[PDB]
Amino acid sequence: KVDPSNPETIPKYMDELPIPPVARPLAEIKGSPYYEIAMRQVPHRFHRLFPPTTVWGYDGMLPGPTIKVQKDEKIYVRWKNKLPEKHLLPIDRTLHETAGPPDVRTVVHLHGANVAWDSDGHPEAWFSRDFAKTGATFRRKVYEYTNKQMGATLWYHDHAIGITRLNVYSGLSGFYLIEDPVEKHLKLPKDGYDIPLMIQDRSFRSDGSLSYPENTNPPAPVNPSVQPFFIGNTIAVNGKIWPKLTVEPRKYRFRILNASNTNAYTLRLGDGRKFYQISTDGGLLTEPVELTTLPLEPAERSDVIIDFSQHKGKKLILQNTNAEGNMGIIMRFDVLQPLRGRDTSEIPAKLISEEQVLYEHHADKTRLLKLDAIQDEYNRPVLLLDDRMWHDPVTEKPVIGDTEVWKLINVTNFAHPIHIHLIQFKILHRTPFDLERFQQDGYIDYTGPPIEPAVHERGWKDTVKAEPGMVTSVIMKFTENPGEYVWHCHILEHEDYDMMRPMRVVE
Numbered sequence: 001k002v003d004p005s006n007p008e009t010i011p012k013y014m015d016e017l018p019i020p021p022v023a024r025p026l027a028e029i030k031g032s033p034y035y036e037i038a039m040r041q042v043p044h045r046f047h048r049l050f051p052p053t054t055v056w057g058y059d060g061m062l063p064g065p066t067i068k069v070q071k072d073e074k075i076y077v078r079w080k081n082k083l084p085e086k087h088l089l090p091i092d093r094t095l096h097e098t099a100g101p102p103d104v105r106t107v108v109h110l111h112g113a114n115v116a117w118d119s120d121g122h123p124e125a126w127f128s129r130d131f132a133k134t135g136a137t138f139r140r141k142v143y144e145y146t147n148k149q150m151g152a153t154l155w156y157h158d159h160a161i162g163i164t165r166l167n168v169y170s171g172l173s174g175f176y177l178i179e180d181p182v183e184k185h186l187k188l189p190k191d192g193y194d195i196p197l198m199i200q201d202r203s204f205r206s207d208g209s210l211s212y213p214e215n216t217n218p219p220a221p222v223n224p225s226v227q228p229f230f231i232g233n234t235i236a237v238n239g240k241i242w243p244k245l246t247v248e249p250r251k252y253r254f255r256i257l258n259a260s261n262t263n264a265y266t267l268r269l270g271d272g273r274k275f276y277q278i279s280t281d282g283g284l285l286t287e288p289v290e291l292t293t294l295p296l297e298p299a300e301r302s303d304v305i306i307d308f309s310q311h312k313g314k315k316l317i318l319q320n321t322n323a324e325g326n327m328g329i330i331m332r333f334d335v336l337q338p339l340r341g342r343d344t345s346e347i348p349a350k351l352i353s354e355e356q357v358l359y360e361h362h363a364d365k366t367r368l369l370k371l372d373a374i375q376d377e378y379n380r381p382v383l384l385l386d387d388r389m390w391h392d393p394v395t396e397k398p399v400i401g402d403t404e405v406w407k408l409i410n411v412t413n414f415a416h417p418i419h420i421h422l423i424q425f426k427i428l429h430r431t432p433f434d435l436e437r438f439q440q441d442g443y444i445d446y447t448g449p450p451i452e453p454a455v456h457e458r459g460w461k462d463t464v465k466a467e468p469g470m471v472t473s474v475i476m477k478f479t480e481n482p483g484e485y486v487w488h489c490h491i492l493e494h495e496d497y498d499m500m501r502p503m504r505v506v507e
């Protein structure tokens with residue numbers, strides 16, 4: 001008997017990985033596509049032998065439909081809250097905007113978008129059902145995505161203040177792909193050989209319902225209470241637990257996204273088989289990079305090419321080397337489909353034809369930004385950026401035209417994936433420091449030389465693993481779109497209490 005709450009009873013590899021359908025526009029105005037995407041409560045089956053689970057899905061599907069655009073192609077999206085009045089999951093009423101009704105508030109952030117602030121999905125721009133109540137920064141029912149950025153695998157997800165962890169866990173995320181003009185003249189695997197992989201950890205009650213904590217263990221006196229992490233006991237890809245993908249012995253492009261609330265994975269293919277990275281969060285690399293492991297924190301993504309042609313007749317497990325047991329397994333590739341005509345795809349010698357260089361010594365401004373926790377009056381951790389809470393006066397006010405270096409000083413014992421909106425950055429380096437000395441008097445005593453970014457994280461990025469006991473330095477240049485944005489940890493349990501700060505980009 002399969003008990004959804006007991007992962008040892010779940011037979012792995014029973015579900016063929018699904019491909020989310022592509023969103024179709026409802027209209028086109030003067031050449032601009034118009035989409036209408038409604039958030040709905042629906043059943044979704046996470047495993048062949050599970051009962052249906054009630055979830056929240058964009059257009060009633062999990063993952064949400066994949067939106068595809070060209071670079072520089074302006075589109076309009078009316079994101080609609082068509083959800084019930086009561087939440088699926090427990091709400092901590094001590095957080096932002098959760099004291100009373102409306103409980104079900106939504107706003108959609110296109111993660112990685114170069115977009116004007118009023119279509120960025122600001123956390124205070126949320127709306128209840130049919131826009132009946134709206135947050136203070138609400139501006140547009142119909143968002144406008146101008147897409148003036150390098151081609152990339154982006155993703156969209158809920159960002160409503162105080163409940164982002166709940167709305168994303170309930171199912172509100174999907175892929176958004178910007179095609180670069182270069183790709184038309186490359187021969188990357190395409191069409192059915194270009195497959196997105198949304199990796200997420202989940203836990204379930206015995207009746208198949210989504211399980212999310214009511215409180216910590218041991219419990220806080222607040223009920224329900226936020227917990228500063230969520231680690232599931234199953235891994236799903238594209239909404240199916242421990243699936244298989246039946247592939248031909250040829251090359252595929254996989255668009256790999258960690259859309260988990262907290263958990264990070266280190267991907268390994270079979271017995272350390274090689275695969276070829278072609279993009280990071282922000283777009284294509286200069287040239288493919290040979291990898292045998294791929295670490296991904298929440299919100300990080302990378303596109304890779306895997307060649308199955310030398311693996312005909314094999315089944316290869318995609319491992320998560322961060323964990324033992326069942327959580328060490330993501331999915332299985334079954335190289336068992338007969339080849340459907342010749343593989344004409346190629347791993348190219350170069351991907352893009354231009355690269356923008358940013359130099360640390362050209363920085364117009366340098367920010368030292370601590371990642372830490374305090375204890376609240378209930379003895380719960382509050383995760384904080386720069387000693388400040390969300391509602392404290394804005395301190396990050398980057399100026400258009402300026403090059404900035406941000407130094408993320410992680411004084412906690414765990415990594416935090418820090419996401420900066422509107423821009424893409426390059427990781428400069430990480431440098432270890434003496435944690436106890438910093439705790440004593442705030443002096444940064446470096447205990448070793450700077451370490452370069454690892455080989456899989458050298459492209460343009462918007463989410464960076466800030467390692468504990470290290471200063472992680474990133475570099476960026478602000479070029480357009482002044483307005484009200486944010487930066488935050490992408491562990492959603494941290495973002496919601498309270499590890500998010502305003503970023504006011506100014507002219």
Ligand SMILES: [Cu+2]
Binds near residue numbers: 383490499
């Ligand atoms: Cu964090």
Ligand SMILES: [Cu+2]
Binds near residue numbers: 486488
């Ligand atoms: Cu965000």
Ligand SMILES: [Mn+2]
Binds near residue numbers: 490
């Ligand atoms: Mn995001």
